[PDB]
């Protein structure tokens, strides 16, 4: 948009001259409000037979809570501001250990000792990001137990007609709402 | 895609030669993971006056729990594997008893003795499948009570300007996550 | 569609002669079933610095519950029919106090004394309706406390590179399911 | 169109969420009101020279009326209900006696002894159904004559540059308006 | 479509390799079967006032029949073959006597002495061909009267807001079905 | 654009989720900067023969300047602010005196006694607004002459094949750039 | 296309009323002129390492000619009519022995003892039909040698990053031009 | 594209201001490089029965070579420049002897006495140009034999269900590459 | 476009085988013929009230000419070739001093002491480049005055409903037509 | 494709939720199977008159074979693996020696002393790559002659109406099928 004046005659550039409302969709939590904090717990290789699923993790509650508290605190310390853990996601990331394989990943979870191997029965189909993301929603682990999110068990399979070797990566993704005051950090003594 | 070789000259068939990412949508529960188990409880005929809704079911808690436990166990026994009831849906299926009628179904629920007849006030509009699906989330019924999902009441109406006779079918649809081990059934003694 | 008969020959007007199914979307609560009841609590002017958010409301629980019970009962009395409060939304409506300003509103909530001023960290982006709507789900306030929804705190900011004066309006929007019987109101004595 | 309720939140399926008036055209009589009754009178083979048409039928009035009354009554008896003959169509169906011939059929009618062979002069062009349909609108044939539709003569040709052998089928198609009472047939004596 | 053979390999040119059914429409009579014979009777100039129509022709029956028989026979004699007059159309062709005029022609007919001037009342609108075509369906005129089509009267107007001078041409268009035998004309004596 | 929060899960409305540069064009002066002031000078009826143009105005310079100064000053007095006459347009507005006429207007101007009637020779074609707009760029008329825009002559014709009566309206349209200070009008004495 | 006549008025159905030339392409031989005769010679399983190709067939000329003559004659005898072998294609059909594998087949041929294993160097890419088709153009095998098409060697590989087990089927496809006289087969003696 | 200059301001006309790469196709030989020379050898009428083909030409080699040498030399003499016969095509042009016939032509060739009549077995389908073009690639005929292109036999049929009379025209089309020097023709003696 | 020859057969790549005229538009002067020379004169900050415009520059003629001559000569010296100043543009470039402001710029010019502040009356609307470009068309400044383009005054405003602080940059853009001979620069003495 | 689980409710990202077969085309040899080896023989400048072609190369057979053997062996030695020369292309690359010339290249070849200059007669048109590619399909040159591809002559012209100077580059492009065993190169002695 450009203007020119020639003896009270004005010029402009030619180029410049030339239902669903009732519904809502949820925002992706990792893309939505709050910070993302990924704590990778472990790696695992499983070989899965067709029409079966293998147990990914079989921790007792005390071990799940010890691993969660330890890893979160070791990574986060010092917690400098008031913050809220909006949610904790158990993330299972899958990949083939072999190239030139074409199949889809299958998963199911639950929130006694679980079966190591189960048959596929109406599973959840894992998308192309090959990740199954499960919503699970102190000074010492002792105080964490004294002051009293679900303990997950997960099964992974494929829709393949042959045995498949899978590499699994299990993580905890924390959704954190940080309340950092409009206050600077000063070297002591302040002022 | 076809290939031909004629004296080091290669040939191929002519025919062969010639934003929203931030958001999520929930999967339909009946189409999603887990098995579907429909227990039809009863059939009912109601005549509904314009601008009114009639009570479909007025069971006491003890009767709702007796009917649910009895029908589920009678249908399922023996429960052979570890399983989880993900959810229980109260399904109300509606149909006109007369042909050549054009109107939409209206519904409302709640989770003292309820009114048999109420006035329509900002109802839920039932879709073209003519079904209103409400999420409600042992050895004897006694043990089921001893070990301690909501008790629903439902109203059905029409947007019709005349009285309408409706046939109602009330069911419980269970969402079941079955954990069947990779283990066969053998005639005893095994091996 | 018009028909004419001329000596057993029939005539008609020329003009008359000439995947996504697996998923669900939630209905907007204010547009969906149940009545809407808006109780405006107060108005507030805040001046917000770039990259910061100011506290909108810092009521103690007892004050939040006193304000909610008082305003709801004063507005609703007499409650003539059986009704259910489906949900309570804390609505924060924002507007600039100045014209010719172009920026987007930013918000974050939480359900000790909160900080008056915080830094913007992965906030929720407020849409073009300039409203942040938070789901929060007796005879005297004493009976309301004796018989025992969350207490919200909200921060508002802008993505502006300059200081901005904002006018805020805080309301409670109640979602009400009214069960009005098919019964008239008669002057006493009835019949 | 499917609806789901989860704790007072409503869901719907995504797929369900996503001049010439001044004029009239006549309805095809065979497709329009009234029954169709086809009485095939005869078959005929004619060889037609280019630019000429041959006489299909040269019956005297008395023979046309004898053939019509006889064939209609022999086919229809007993006429059980009140009925009206809306119209009578003389239908001439044409086909080549040879395969691999490509030409169009030509026709002309009239309602002294007619010429057997005439020259083509501004004829009617027969369509791809190869049928020329001409609208022509008692106890004994004697009573039919005593109580007193036109007698047709028809010529058929081709636009071919060679002699063509044609197979002709001549029929009478009656348009019948039946007035069958809402009354059953009982074995005598009735009741 | 071209084909080439090179040592049992076949080649083809690349370019060669790459509801309303229930209704009928009448064919335009002048374009349809039968010959057209135009007998122009006379020319006439009329000046028509806005919202009025002037009488085009006011002949007595005897004059209409004398003019028709005389003009048809004078033009046609000798009638060499058997023929049928399918129909007679009274054609009124209109044109402005002045250039640079923009208006539409209006017409009405009827099949006592008629009024010379009438008011326009729900007329027929003449199309862009500026022609109003009305279907009207011996040795001496005496024999034509002795052996015993309607006598038309026509009014023409305009939708103009001023007086308009119109040139009218009145004709009779005959639709003739000629039955010319497949027989030559020989100089006498034949053979 | 609407936002909802349900237990740290964020929601948005579905509808909201879903060369020539080198050249310039002049702005229409009547639509462009500066005020418009129309002084209608006179009305005139002319009858124009085909292929000819008639003189609209034949004023001497002194009369053109007297008429312009008088009409402008009589209309404008008092000139309260500093202003600049950017341009003066001689506007000739044309219309037929008769309805139902279809032709285009033709014009030519010039800035001895002119011919009253000229032949059409490569004229300017007047557009559908039927206006020909010609750019022409004190206390007493005497001072206006003492202190010392062109004097126009205009011809109007038609492309019609007949004589046409035209109604002409001749005006002067002034383009005025007003410099009104940011100062109020006070009743004397001020303050 | 249907026609109707009503009192000399004709009716028709409404529905019926409403560069690269310089070049040639070769016809697919199996789809083109001449009969197809497939003689399957053998089946073979090969395991191919990434970036390598394995020899499919390493027959001496005498063995290739013995296998070809024997299989063709055993299948064809008696050759009842004059015929011409237009061409002989060596067809190598490939398939994975495992499901859920995604890769493309690679091939190369040649028309001393060949290497069993070679490296992939600018190969021919096999299309989606997984077939590599190579054009190769008596009473006893002795007479076939006495009266004196090329002897092929073929390599097959994949573009896979892992070792792949392939099932190969090697065939000879004959293109046969049969000249069967217009003469019947009679039981002897004829006539 | 037009340019105008008005006092250092430049003007231009408004109208002026406003995969398959890996493959080759052969050029049609008659449209491609080299001259075309058509020598028509003979005309022939054949009547072909359905599902049969008739022999077009049954010349002995000596006759084919005599006819070819004689016709080529008689037509070409004197051969004034160095030239190369790129190819010789046997062209068979077909046409029906009767009008109003719709069928496709069928052909087959071969390069003992051949059968006059054969059955159609997987023929070549002749395109809409009705031509079958077969590539066949001295001072006296004696020298042509002394110094030592194939001898063709051709069959023609139709896909017709009746007997068809065909007119055949057999030609030889020569593809000639002429090397005419950049040298004039002078009357002797030159210079 | 690629060509291949195989034994007199030619190949080509497949990919290669597959009103307003009456008017003119002016070319943008800065993009059109002649060089551009920008002499920035000064920077200025103005605060403009809604519905008002502030004076940008109020130089006397002698100061405008002194500033123009001085700046042009200081920048250009030495003028080595014959050149023509086609035009001089007064360019006023505007920008807000604050971010997050949305309004359009308004301007007016004129070519006594002018008012510092005027009311907006039919202004020129400044385009998105935020520039108002006004066409204005020796050895010492004394000689420049002795040998004898307009002196501009400019007002700038906004369409804003609040007071706005604007940063203005005033420049002179010269359009220069340089006539540099086809002659080199040599160090003296030449040759 | 991303999946989320919230209390047995499954979520997916919205974005993820939303004839010629009978013919073959030859693959470009330089893009198809086998390696490419370009041996540039020489450069040449020719001036070609309109409607004429100049001889590019006039080598005797012995010189063509000496140049080919020498250049191929000098470039290739040592030939380390078994290889097959699939084809040899004579490539003539053309370019103008002058800029701002617009014409197309013309070519013709042949496989006595040839004329240096010939007239253009039905040539091959060279495409936009300006290359004419002609398919032409030991220890010492003596052994190459002792053990016994065509010798080409090429003419180049233009469709220009003036004389044109052309730069020509003549090369031999070899198509090589390398059979490199799956065997490494070891320093002697191996193992």
Swiss-Prot record, chains A, B, C, D, E, F, G, H, I, J:
Q: Where, per UniProt, does this protein localize?
A: Host nucleus
Tell me which GO cellular component terms the UniProt record holds. host cell nuclear matrix; viral occlusion body
Pfam assignment, any one: Polyhedrin
Gene Ontology MF terms: identical protein binding; structural molecule activity
What's in the keyword line of the UniProt record?
A: Host nucleus, Viral occlusion body
Q: Which family does it belong to?
A: Belongs to the polyhedrin family.
Job description of the protein: Major component of the virus occlusion bodies which are large proteinaceous structures termed polyhedra. These structures serve as the protective package for the virus particles outside the infected host and allow natural transmission of virus between insect hosts, assisting persistence in the environment. Forms the paracrystalline lattice of polyhedra and interacts with enveloped virions as well as other accessory molecules and structures to form a mature viral occlusion body.
State what protein this is by name: Polyhedrin
Question: Where does this protein come from, organism-wise?
Answer: Autographa californica nuclear polyhedrosis virus
Name of the gene: PH
């Amino acid at each position: 948009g450009r203007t020119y004046v020639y003896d009270n005659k004005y010029y402009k550039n030619l180029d410049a001259v030339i239902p669903l409302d009732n519904y809502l969709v949820a925002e992706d939590p990792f893309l939505g409000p709050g910070k993302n904090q990924k704590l990778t717990l472990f790696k695992e290789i499983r070989n899965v037979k067709p029409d079966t699923m293998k147990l990914v993790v079989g921790w007792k509650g005390k071990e799940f809570y010890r691993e969660t508290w330890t890893r979160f605190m070791e990574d986060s310390f010092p917690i400098v501001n008031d913050q809220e853990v909006m949610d904790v996601f158990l993330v299972v990331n899958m990949r083939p250990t072999r190239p030139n394989r074409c199949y889809k990943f299958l998963a199911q979870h639950a929130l006694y000792v679980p079966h190591d191997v189960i048959r596929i029965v109406e599973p959840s189909w894992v998308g192309s990001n090959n990740e199954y993301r499960i919503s699970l929603a102190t000074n010492s682990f002792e105080q964490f137990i004294d002051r009293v999110f679900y303990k997950p068990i997960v099964y992974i399979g494929t829709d393949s007609a042959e045995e498949e070797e899978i590499l699994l990566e299990v993580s905890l993704v924390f959704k954190v709402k940080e309340f950092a005051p409009d206050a600077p950090l000063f070297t002591g003594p302040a002022y």
